[PDB]
């Protein structure tokens, strides 16, 4: 999906 | 402590396609504003026309079709008609909204670029950040990047200090804000920690006051001169999406995954008011059940007036009263 904040 | 709608724009194939607005920004004089998003176009609107025309008429004065989905816009602060975009292929483009043509394309990022920002005080300089874990500084006079910063995690947001082109705030997926002096990128000047998830936005209230947003459902305020955490703001829901952050000298405003715009005063940790997007014809094009989110916000620089847009492509002009 679009405009999802990346996770780390 | 109330938000009021003074204009509403639904333009495009709203009911049959994806129309997330990833970015909404006023130009240098708050006269035009532009939107970009997953519909692969940059729209430019005349603010005065928007707030004075009748509804079901609102349309952009300019629409520029793009190759890829867009993540961010930044107007140039000196060439009023120039505007930069970042897109999902990594490309950073500078456009002329009067001729509707691209002026320059920067194609060094290897992955989706999330953010671009034109410097106010050195207006030929443009900074970008990307999933490729790089920050790149571009000069419109040159074809190759002039500075490159190799970072450890996805870069979600970049912003120039409003008083000096030698400093940038960088929001990382490692949950920290990295505050760089671009004259010596060997290490960041300061690292601000406290967020529990990626830092999705960074915006300056002033030369020394920095706000951040994160998918830990907080906004945070920092002092980049004194190297201090200042305040934490809670009350909105933001655990997943880019929902927008905009600040002025006194207020912070952000989106939420409940289709709500929130406003915080910078001294108070709970929201002062909020506005809820949504409509009967979108309730049962079904799913304001949880799916719709605010996706971009932008204060007018000289008024408590706010541009707002959400994941269904609705644009509203709000006023704070």
Rounded to a whole number of angstroms, the distance from the CA of B53 to the nearest CA of chain A is 31
Three-state DSSP class for B151?
coil
> What span, in angstroms and rounded, lies between the C-alpha atoms of B272 and B260?
13
Q: Could you tell me the two tokens for B92?
A: 């950073």
3-class secondary structure, B170: strand
Which H or E run contains B50? Answer: helix B47-52
List the one residue out of B92, B85, B132, B135 whose CA is nearest residue B110: B132
Measure the CA–CA gap between B247 and B229, rounded to whole angstroms.
Answer: 17
- CB count within 10 Å of CB B308 equals 26
For chain B, how many structural domains are there in total? 1
Q: What is the DSSP string of B71-95?
A: EEEEE-SSSTTEEEEEETTS-EEEE
Burial of B273 (0-12, 13-18, 19+ CB in 10 A): middle
Which helix or strand (DSSP H or E) is residue B282 part of? helix B280-283
Domain containing residue B165: CATH number: 2.130.10.10
Q: Look at B198 and A5 and tell me if their CB atoms are within 8 Å.
A: yes
Q: Minimal Cα–Cα distance from A7 to chain B, Å?
A: 6
Residues of chain B with Cβ-Cβ distance to A2 below 8 Å are 18, 20, 22, 38, 69, 88
Structure tokens at B249: 């000298």
Please check whether residue B200 touches A, CB under 8 A.
yes
Task: Give the Cα separation of B235 and B107 in Å (integer).
Answer: 39
The alpha carbon of residue B174 is apart from the nearest alpha carbon of chain A, in Å, by 6
With H, G, I as helix, E, B as strand and everything else as coil, classify residue B99.
coil
Secondary structure percentages of chain B, helix, strand, coil, to 5: 5, 50, 50
Q: Identify whether the C-beta of residue B290 lies closer than 8 Å to the C-beta of residue B276.
A: no
Neighbours of B289 (CB within 10 A): 7
**Rounded to whole angstroms, how far apart are CA atoms B36 and B97?**
13
Listed by number, the residues of chain B in 128-157 with a beta carbon closer than 8 Å to a beta carbon of chain A are: 131, 153-154, 156
Question: What is the SS3 assignment for B49?
Answer: helix
Q: Which domain holds residue B260?
A: 1-321
Q: Facing residues of B231 across strands?
A: B221
Q: How far is A8 from chain B, CA to nearest CA, in Å?
A: 5
CB B86 within 8 A of CB B70: yes
Question: What's the half-sphere exposure (Cβ side, CA atoms, 13 Å) at B316?
Answer: 21
Hey, is the C-beta of B38 within 8 angstroms of any chain A C-beta? yes
Q: What angle do CA A7, B241, B286 make, to 5 degrees?
A: 135
CA distance B154 to B172: 6
The DSSP 8-state label assigned to residue B30 in this structure reads S
Instruction: Give chain A positions within 8 Å (CB) of B131.
Output: 6
Residue B20 in contact with residue B40, Cβ under 8 Å? no
Which among B20, B69, B173 has CB closest to A6? B173
What resolution (Å)? Answer: 1.6
Laid out side by side, the sheet with B82-87 consists of B70-75, B82-87, B92-96, B101-106
Nearest C-alpha neighbor of B147 from the set B164, B166, B161: B166
**DSSP-derived secondary structure letter, B280:** H
- Experimentally, the structure was elucidated by X-ray
Can you say how many angstroms the Cα of residue B5 is from the centroid of all Cα atoms in its chain? 21
Asked whether the beta carbons of residue B154 and residue A6 sit closer than 8 angstroms, the reply is: yes
């Amino acid at each position: 999906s679009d405009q999802i904040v990346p996770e780390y | 402590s109330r938000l009021r709608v003074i204009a509403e724009i639904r333009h495009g194939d709203i009911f049959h396609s994806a129309n997330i607005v990833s970015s909404i920004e006023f130009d240098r004089d708050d006269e035009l504003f532009a939107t970009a998003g997953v519909s692969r176009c940059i729209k430019v609107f005349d603010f005065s026309s928007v707030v004075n025309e009748p509804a079901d008429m609102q349309c952009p004065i300019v629409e520029m079709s793009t190759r890829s989905k867009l993540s961010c816009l930044s107007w140039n602060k000196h060439e009023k008609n120039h505007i930069a975009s970042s897109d999902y292929e990594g490309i950073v483009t500078v456009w002329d909204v009067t001729t509707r043509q691209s002026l320059m394309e920067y194609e060094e990022h290897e992955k989706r670029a999330w953010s671009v920002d034109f410097s106010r005080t050195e207006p030929s300089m443009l900074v970008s950040g990307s999933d490729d874990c790089k920050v790149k500084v571009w000069c419109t006079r040159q074809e190759a990047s002039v500075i490159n910063i190799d970072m450890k995690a996805n870069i979600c947001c970049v912003k120039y200090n409003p008083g000096s082109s030698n400093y940038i705030a960088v929001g990382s997926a490692d949950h920290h804000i990295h505050y760089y002096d671009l004259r010596n990128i060997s290490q960041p000047l300061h690292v601000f920690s406290g967020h529990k998830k990626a830092v999705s936005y960074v915006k300056f209230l002033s030369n020394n006051e920095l706000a951040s947003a994160s998918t830990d459902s907080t906004l945070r305020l920092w002092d980049v001169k004194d190297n201090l955490p200042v305040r934490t703001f809670r009350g909105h829901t933001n655990e997943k999406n880019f929902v927008g952050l905009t600040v002025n000298s006194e207020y912070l405003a952000c989106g939420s995954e409940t289709n709500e715009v929130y406003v915080y005063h910078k001294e108070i940790t709970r929201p002062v008011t909020s506005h809820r997007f949504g409509s009967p014809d979108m309730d049962d094009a079904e799913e304001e059940a949880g799916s719709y989110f605010i996706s971009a916000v932008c204060w007018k620089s000289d008024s408590p007036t706010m541009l707002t847009a959400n994941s269904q492509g609705t644009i509203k002009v709000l006023v704070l009263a």
